[PDB]
PDB file of C-alpha atoms (C1' of nucleotides) in Angstrom:
ATOM      1  CA  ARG A   1     108.920  56.046   6.024  1.00 53.37           C
ATOM      2  CA  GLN A   2     112.337  54.660   6.919  1.00 55.74           C
ATOM      3  CA  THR A   3     113.524  51.246   5.676  1.00 61.46           C
ATOM      4  CA  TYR A   4     115.487  49.307   8.285  1.00 61.89           C
ATOM      5  CA  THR A   5     118.812  47.807   7.338  1.00 66.07           C
ATOM      6  CA  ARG A   6     119.492  44.090   7.436  1.00 69.17           C
ATOM      7  CA  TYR A   7     121.711  44.816  10.445  1.00 65.75           C
ATOM      8  CA  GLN A   8     119.137  46.868  12.352  1.00 63.90           C
ATOM      9  CA  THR A   9     116.493  44.208  11.766  1.00 62.87           C
ATOM     10  CA  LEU A  10     118.786  41.364  12.834  1.00 64.94           C
ATOM     11  CA  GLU A  11     119.872  43.035  16.042  1.00 63.07           C
ATOM     12  CA  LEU A  12     116.227  43.672  16.860  1.00 63.33           C
ATOM     13  CA  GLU A  13     115.161  40.154  16.023  1.00 61.78           C
ATOM     14  CA  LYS A  14     118.003  38.727  18.097  1.00 58.18           C
ATOM     15  CA  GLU A  15     116.842  40.822  21.057  1.00 56.94           C
ATOM     16  CA  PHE A  16     113.218  39.736  20.586  1.00 54.33           C
ATOM     17  CA  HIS A  17     114.467  36.140  20.905  1.00 54.83           C
ATOM     18  CA  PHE A  18     115.126  36.966  24.567  1.00 54.13           C
ATOM     19  CA  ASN A  19     112.618  39.654  25.692  1.00 54.89           C
ATOM     20  CA  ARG A  20     109.365  40.268  23.836  1.00 56.35           C
ATOM     21  CA  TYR A  21     109.046  43.344  26.055  1.00 56.12           C
ATOM     22  CA  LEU A  22     111.745  45.903  26.640  1.00 54.05           C
ATOM     23  CA  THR A  23     112.722  47.932  29.662  1.00 56.91           C
ATOM     24  CA  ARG A  24     113.130  51.647  29.432  1.00 60.38           C
ATOM     25  CA  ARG A  25     116.841  51.143  30.149  1.00 61.72           C
ATOM     26  CA  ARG A  26     117.204  48.477  27.432  1.00 63.89           C
ATOM     27  CA  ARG A  27     115.116  50.464  24.923  1.00 68.56           C
ATOM     28  CA  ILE A  28     117.458  53.403  25.270  1.00 68.69           C
ATOM     29  CA  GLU A  29     120.584  51.297  24.702  1.00 70.84           C
ATOM     30  CA  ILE A  30     119.200  49.718  21.567  1.00 69.39           C
ATOM     31  CA  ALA A  31     117.923  53.049  20.220  1.00 69.24           C
ATOM     32  CA  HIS A  32     121.461  54.438  20.427  1.00 73.63           C
ATOM     33  CA  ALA A  33     123.341  51.423  19.146  1.00 71.00           C
ATOM     34  CA  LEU A  34     121.044  51.194  16.123  1.00 71.91           C
ATOM     35  CA  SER A  35     120.584  54.927  15.551  1.00 72.25           C
ATOM     36  CA  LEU A  36     116.776  54.776  15.777  1.00 71.58           C
ATOM     37  CA  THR A  37     114.496  56.758  18.070  1.00 73.49           C
ATOM     38  CA  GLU A  38     113.004  55.147  21.167  1.00 73.89           C
ATOM     39  CA  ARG A  39     109.646  55.531  19.499  1.00 73.69           C
ATOM     40  CA  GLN A  40     110.780  53.411  16.575  1.00 74.56           C
ATOM     41  CA  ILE A  41     112.046  50.726  18.936  1.00 74.05           C
ATOM     42  CA  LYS A  42     108.765  50.824  20.828  1.00 73.24           C
ATOM     43  CA  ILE A  43     106.775  50.498  17.612  1.00 72.67           C
ATOM     44  CA  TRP A  44     108.996  47.769  16.181  1.00 69.94           C
ATOM     45  CA  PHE A  45     108.329  45.606  19.236  1.00 71.79           C
ATOM     46  CA  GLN A  46     104.642  46.536  19.147  1.00 73.60           C
ATOM     47  CA  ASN A  47     104.475  45.243  15.552  1.00 74.52           C
ATOM     48  CA  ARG A  48     106.749  42.278  16.168  1.00 71.99           C
ATOM     49  CA  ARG A  49     104.532  41.070  19.017  1.00 67.88           C
ATOM     50  CA  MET A  50     101.471  41.292  16.750  1.00 69.46           C
ATOM     51  CA  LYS A  51     103.181  39.273  14.044  1.00 70.44           C
ATOM     52  CA  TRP A  52     104.183  36.699  16.664  1.00 72.64           C
ATOM     53  CA  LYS A  53     100.656  36.028  18.025  1.00 75.92           C
ATOM     54  CA  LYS A  54      99.371  35.519  14.483  1.00 73.33           C
ATOM     55  CA  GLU A  55     102.456  33.668  13.225  1.00 77.21           C
ATOM     56  CA  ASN A  56     102.945  31.131  16.012  1.00 75.69           C
TER      57      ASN A  56
ATOM     58  C1'  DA B   1      95.176  60.767  39.079  1.00 79.03           C
ATOM     59  C1'  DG B   2      97.977  61.147  35.021  1.00 76.45           C
ATOM     60  C1'  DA B   3     101.737  60.018  32.230  1.00 77.84           C
ATOM     61  C1'  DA B   4     103.687  56.218  29.836  1.00 82.80           C
ATOM     62  C1'  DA B   5     103.281  51.986  27.339  1.00 80.81           C
ATOM     63  C1'  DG B   6     100.618  48.308  25.093  1.00 80.54           C
ATOM     64  C1'  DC B   7      96.838  46.218  21.940  1.00 81.01           C
ATOM     65  C1'  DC B   8      94.718  46.413  17.472  1.00 85.50           C
ATOM     66  C1'  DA B   9      93.076  47.534  13.034  1.00 86.25           C
ATOM     67  C1'  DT B  10      94.312  50.021   9.274  1.00 83.85           C
ATOM     68  C1'  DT B  11      97.113  53.032   6.243  1.00 83.64           C
ATOM     69  C1'  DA B  12     100.566  53.770   2.901  1.00 85.74           C
ATOM     70  C1'  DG B  13     105.275  53.964   1.123  1.00 82.40           C
ATOM     71  C1'  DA B  14     109.287  51.401  -0.754  1.00 80.33           C
ATOM     72  C1'  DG B  15     111.147  47.890  -3.802  1.00 76.26           C
TER      73       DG B  15
ATOM     74  C1'  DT C   1     100.662  45.299  -9.764  1.00 74.51           C
ATOM     75  C1'  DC C   2     101.662  43.306  -5.517  1.00 72.47           C
ATOM     76  C1'  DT C   3     104.089  42.384  -1.048  1.00 71.79           C
ATOM     77  C1'  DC C   4     105.897  43.626   3.299  1.00 73.14           C
ATOM     78  C1'  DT C   5     106.110  46.467   7.122  1.00 73.50           C
ATOM     79  C1'  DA C   6     107.028  51.287   9.077  1.00 73.14           C
ATOM     80  C1'  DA C   7     103.695  54.179  11.251  1.00 75.84           C
ATOM     81  C1'  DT C   8      99.301  56.073  12.832  1.00 78.62           C
ATOM     82  C1'  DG C   9      95.196  56.700  15.863  1.00 79.27           C
ATOM     83  C1'  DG C  10      91.960  55.442  19.240  1.00 79.72           C
ATOM     84  C1'  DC C  11      91.065  52.965  23.339  1.00 77.44           C
ATOM     85  C1'  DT C  12      92.762  50.288  27.308  1.00 76.30           C
ATOM     86  C1'  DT C  13      96.121  48.995  30.792  1.00 77.65           C
ATOM     87  C1'  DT C  14      99.953  49.528  33.857  1.00 76.86           C
ATOM     88  C1'  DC C  15     102.386  52.106  37.456  1.00 76.84           C
TER      89       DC C  15
END
DNA sequence: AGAAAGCCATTAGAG
DNA sequence: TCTCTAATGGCTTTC
C-alpha cells in the first residue's frame, strides 16, 4: 500500500471539484504530473465518488 | 461482441 | 487499539 502525499491528495481533490469523472486524456496527464499509475487515479476517483454519495 | 470503466462491499496496511 | 483509505474482486454498464 502506498500513502499519498498531501500534495498528491490536494491536486486530486482540486480536480474532483471540477470533474467527478475523468477523461482518458485527463487521467493520463494527472497520472504523470503526480507520478501515480492510471490505475491509481482511476481507483482514487472510484473511492472519492463513493465517499461523496455517502458524505453529501 | 468485447474491451474498458464504473459501482459496491469489503479487506488490510500505515500512522 | 483504532482510524482512515489504498486496493481488491465480482458484477454491471458504457462504447
